[PDB]
C-alpha cells in the first residue's frame, strides 16, 4: 500500500457549480459536497457537485439538517444511476487557497471513513475571465513525518504545473498534507457544443447596419482624425535630441501621436470594408 502520482479528473458541470455557488456566497466560506467515483488506485474522477442548506458567520460556516443529505442522494439514484461521494469543497475568498485549521479538522473525519477523500479549494475572486484558480489537497499523517509518503516513480506530480506558491506553503506544503494535480476530461458530445455558442443565425451575417449612422460615424471619426494629424505634424517635426528614453519619459502624460493614428485607421477600414462587402452580396445573391 502506497501513494502514486495521482490525478483528479473532473466533470465540466462541476466547475461551473463550484464558482457560481462560490461567487453568490462571496464574503464567507460556502460549503458543498463532491460526488464522483474511485476509478482506480491511481486517479480519481468527480462527475457531480451539489450543495446543501447552510448557516454561516463571518469567520465560520456550518451545515444544517442531515435529513437533506440522504434524501438528496436517494433521488439522484433513481433518476440517472447511483454513485459515490468522493470528497467535498469550499471557498477561501481572496485568500491564499490553503487549508485552514478548521478545514483540516473535518479531514480526519473524512479520511477515516473513506481513504482518498479529497479536499478541494476554489476561489472566485483571484479567478479572471482568462483562467480559474482551482485547487485540491490531500491530507498526510504526522506519524510518518520522517518516513517517505510518496514513492515518486515519475515526474508528473513533482515539477509540473508549478512549484508551490509562497502564500500557500506558508501554512501547508509540504507540512500536514500534499497537493495533487488536476486536469480536464471532455466527452466529445459536450466538446462539440462548448465550441459553438457565440455564433448567430444568418440574420446577423447579412445586416447592413444603417447608412445614416454609418456615414455619421465616418463623419465623426475623420473629424478628430484631422485634429490628430494637427498634433502629429508638431511632434514628429519637433524631435529634441534628447536620447529617446527621455523622449519616452516626457510622453507619459497627455502625449499621443502615432497611437490613435494607427487606431482610427483600423476602425475606418474594417467598418467600411464589411459595410461595402455585405452590400455587394445582397445584390449578387438576391434576384
Amino acid at each position: 500500500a502506497v501513494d502514486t502520482a495521482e490525478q483528479v479528473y473532473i466533470s465540466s458541470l462541476a466547475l461551473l457549480k463550484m464558482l457560481k455557488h462560490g461567487r453568490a456566497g462571496v464574503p464567507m466560506e460556502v460549503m458543498g459536497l463532491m460526488l464522483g467515483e474511485f476509478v482506480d488506485d491511481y486517479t480519481v474522477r468527480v462527475i457531480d457537485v451539489f450543495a446543501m442548506p447552510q448557516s454561516g458567520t463571518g469567520v465560520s460556516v456550518e451545515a444544517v439538517d442531515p435529513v437533506f443529505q440522504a434524501k438528496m442522494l436517494d433521488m439522484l439514484k433513481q433518476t440517472g444511476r447511483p454513485e459515490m461521494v468522493v470528497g467535498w469543497y469550499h471557498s477561501h475568498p481572496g485568500f491564499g487557497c490553503w487549508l485552514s485549521g478548521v478545514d483540516i479538522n473535518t479531514q480526519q473525519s473524512f479520511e477515516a471513513l473513506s481513504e482518498r477523500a479529497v479536499a478541494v479549494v476554489v476561489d472566485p475572486i483571484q479567478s479572471v475571465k482568462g483562467k480559474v484558480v482551482i485547487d485540491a489537497f490531500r491530507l498526510i499523517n504526522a506519524n510518518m513525518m520522517v518516513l517517505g509518503h510518496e514513492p515518486r516513480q515519475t515526474t508528473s506530480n513533482l515539477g509540473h504545473l508549478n512549484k508551490p506558491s509562497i502564500q500557500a506553503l506558508i501554512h501547508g506544503l509540504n507540512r500536514h498534507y500534499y497537493s495533487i494535480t488536476i486536469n480536464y476530461r471532455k466527452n466529445e458530445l459536450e466538446q462539440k457544443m462548448l465550441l459553438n455558442l457565440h455564433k448567430k443565425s444568418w440574420m446577423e451575417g447579412l445586416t447592413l447596419q444603417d447608412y445614416s449612422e454609418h456615414c455619421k460615424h465616418n463623419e465623426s471619426v475623420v473629424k478628430e482624425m484631422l485634429e490628430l494629424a494637427k498634433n502629429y505634424n508638431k511632434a514628429v517635426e519637433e524631435e529634441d535630441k534628447m536620447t529617446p528614453e527621455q523622449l519616452a519619459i516626457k510622453n507619459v502624460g497627455k502625449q499621443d501621436p502615432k497611437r490613435h493614428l494607427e487606431e482610427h485607421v483600423d476602425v475606418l477600414m474594417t467598418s467600411n470594408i464589411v459595410q461595402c462587402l455585405a452590400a455587394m452580396l445582397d445584390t449578387v445573391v438576391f434576384k
Partner: protein, 50 residues
C-alpha cells in the same frame, strides 16, 4: 437555567466586529469606493442582496 446562560455565551464568543465606513461613490455595479473613518480609502463590493 444557568446552563442556558452558558450556551448563549458559547454562541457569543465567535462573533467578530465589523469596520464602520462611509460610501464615497459607486464605481460599477459591484465596485464601490468607501472610506474608513480613521483614514484611508478602499475599493470594495457588496454581497448580493443589499
Amino acid at each position: 437555567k444557568q446552563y442556558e446562560k452558558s450556551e448563549n455565551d458559547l454562541k457569543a464568543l465567535q462573533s467578530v466586529g465589523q469596520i464602520v465606513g462611509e460610501v464615497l461613490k459607486q464605481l460599477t455595479e459591484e465596485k464601490f469606493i468607501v472610506k474608513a473613518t480613521n483614514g484611508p480609502r478602499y475599493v470594495v463590493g457588496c454581497r448580493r442582496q443589499l
